[PDB]
Amino acid sequence: MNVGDRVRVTSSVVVYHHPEHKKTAFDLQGMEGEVAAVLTEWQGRPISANLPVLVKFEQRFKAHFRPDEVTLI
Amino acid sequence: NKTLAAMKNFAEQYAKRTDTYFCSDLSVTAVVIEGLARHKEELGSPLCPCRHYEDKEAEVKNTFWNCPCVPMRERKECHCMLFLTPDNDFAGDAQDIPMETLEEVKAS
Amino acid sequence: EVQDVNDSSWKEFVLESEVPVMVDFWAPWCGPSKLIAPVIDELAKEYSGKIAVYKLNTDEAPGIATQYNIRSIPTVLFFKNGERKESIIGAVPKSTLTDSIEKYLS
Numbered sequence: 001m002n003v004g005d006r007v008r009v010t011s012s013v014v015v016y017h018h019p020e021h022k023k024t025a026f027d028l029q030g031m032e033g034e035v036a037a038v039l040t041e042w043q044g045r046p047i048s049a050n051l052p053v054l055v056k057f058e059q060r061f062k063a064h065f066r067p068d069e070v071t072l073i
Numbered sequence: 074n075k076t077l078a079a080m081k082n083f084a085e086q087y088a089k090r091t092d093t094y095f096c097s098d099l100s101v102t103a104v105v106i107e108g109l110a111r112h113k114e115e116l117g118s119p120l121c122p123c124r125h126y127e128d129k130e131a132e133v134k135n136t137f138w139n140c141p142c143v144p145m146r147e148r149k150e151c152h153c154m155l156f157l158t159p160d161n162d163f164a165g166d167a168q169d170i171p172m173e174t175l176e177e178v179k180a181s
Numbered sequence: 182e183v184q185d186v187n188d189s190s191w192k193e194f195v196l197e198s199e200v201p202v203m204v205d206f207w208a209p210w211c212g213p214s215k216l217i218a219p220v221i222d223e224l225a226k227e228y229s230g231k232i233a234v235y236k237l238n239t240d241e242a243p244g245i246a247t248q249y250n251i252r253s254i255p256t257v258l259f260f261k262n263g264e265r266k267e268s269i270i271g272a273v274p275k276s277t278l279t280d281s282i283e284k285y286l287s
């Protein structure tokens with residue numbers, strides 16, 4: 001949405017890159033974090049990133065999402 | 074090629090490190106690797122060969138679709154079908170591709 | 182064989198056909214492209230004069246690929262009376278493509 005918003009993961013997102021669960025399936029739903037970036041353009045030029053919403057959580061752990069997977073607070 | 078050999082190695086090493094397997098039709102694996110290599114050459118980074126880009130060079134600098142891409146690193150979803158999860162039916166059981174087969178598809 | 186279509190032959194071959202059109206957006210160095218190609222070839226024979234089947238190389242014809250915002254490949258696009266009817270992404274099974282063909286006939 002807008003950079004630096006509190007958002008909740010409200011869809012089944014399974015990640016294999018979480019520090020507490022390195023190289024293992026871990027669902028993210030129900031977690032809360034901040035919108036670090038909304039990837040659409042590099043230097044005013046259009047980009048095809050299909051998970052534009054980057055959310056920073058705790059432990060400096062971050063994940064990319066589709067807009068429909070996350071909700072504002 | 075030395076680039077193809079470098080690309081080959083990354084695919085083989087990364088597959089093992091992630092518990093993913095190459096396609097049961099290795100000619101498919103061969104196509105992708107070579108496409109990654111061709112992109113490595115002209116663009117700098119091994120930009121995913123199974124997408125269309127409005128701006129290849131900007132795409133290389135956002136790094137999103139730079140192999141291994143964000144989807145494959147976080148969600149293990151690889152749509153070129155280079156890195157297949159065990160449950161996928163197209164997943165063979167090799168994690169190694171002969172240097173020989175990679176040129177065979179370049180001629181084919 | 183399934184004929185190929187470019188930037189200059191799009192309007193005619195696709196947008197103006199009186200029969201429903203199934204277009205295969207592909208690329209010479211995309212794995213799954215090699216996989217659907219046979220299926221697209223088999224589906225052509227099966228539905229002669231019932232639907233129009235064409236292949237579009239995204240490298241060769243980047244203007245159309247841009248025009249229809251084709252992002253993932255292979256994509257298979259469906260056209261009825263020059264209207265973009267459907268978008269199926271990836272190495273689609275024959276049955277799924279079959280099921281889509283029926284949805285557009287008489």
Ligand code: SF4
Pocket residue numbers: 105120121122123138139140141142145150151152153154155156
């Ligand atoms: S989809 Fe991602 S992981 Fe798979 S080949 Fe393309 S860039 Fe690599």
